Amino acid sequence: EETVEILFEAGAAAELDDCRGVSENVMLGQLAPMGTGAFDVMIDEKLLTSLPADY
């Protein structure tokens, strides 16, 4: 609701959004912290160095 007046007040005093809500990340589309998304995967530089010269 009140989007026109929200924009009015935003132009009046530079409204800013914290984006703390889950709706922002849902709109952005980031992997959720659950199941397969409960961790991070990093490339193993040490293993690649330990790989043969072709790898």
Partner 1 sequence: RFGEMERDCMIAHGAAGFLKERLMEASDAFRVHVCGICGLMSVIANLKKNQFECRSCKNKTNIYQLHIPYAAKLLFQELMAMNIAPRLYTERSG
Partner 2 sequence: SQFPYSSAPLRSVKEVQFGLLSPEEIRAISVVKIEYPEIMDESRQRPREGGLNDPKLGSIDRNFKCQTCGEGMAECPGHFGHMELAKPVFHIGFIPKIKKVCECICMNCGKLLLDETNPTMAQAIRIRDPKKRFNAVWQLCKTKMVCECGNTQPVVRKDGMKLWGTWRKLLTPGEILNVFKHISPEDCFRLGFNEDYARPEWMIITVLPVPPPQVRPSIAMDETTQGQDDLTHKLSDILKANINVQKLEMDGSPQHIINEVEQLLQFHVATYMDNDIAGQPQALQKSGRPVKAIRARLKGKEGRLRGNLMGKRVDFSARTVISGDPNLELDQVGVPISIAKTLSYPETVTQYNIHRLTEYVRNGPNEHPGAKYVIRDNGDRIDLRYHKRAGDIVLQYGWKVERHLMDDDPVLFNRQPSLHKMSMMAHRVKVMPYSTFRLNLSVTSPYNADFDGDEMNLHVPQSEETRAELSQLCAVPLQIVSPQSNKPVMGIVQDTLCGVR
Partner 3 sequence: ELAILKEERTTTPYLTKYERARILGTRALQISMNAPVLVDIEGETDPLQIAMKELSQRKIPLVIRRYLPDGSYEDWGCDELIVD
Is residue 6 part of the contact set for partner 1 (CB under 8 A)?
A: no
Which tokens sit at 33?
């912290």
Q: Judge contact between 15 and 6, C-beta under 8 A.
A: yes
Q: How far is the CB of 50 from partner 2 (least distance, A)?
A: 26
> Which residues contact partner 3 (rule: CB under 8 A)?
33, 35-36, 38-44, 46-48, 51, 54-55
Rounded to a whole number of angstroms, the CA Rg of the chain reads 22
**How far separated are the first and last CA of the chain, in Å rounded?**
58
**Span 7-26, contacts to partner 2 by CB under 8 A:** 7-19, 24-25
- Contact residues toward partner 1 (CB under 8 A) are 7, 10-11, 16, 18-19, 26-32, 34-38
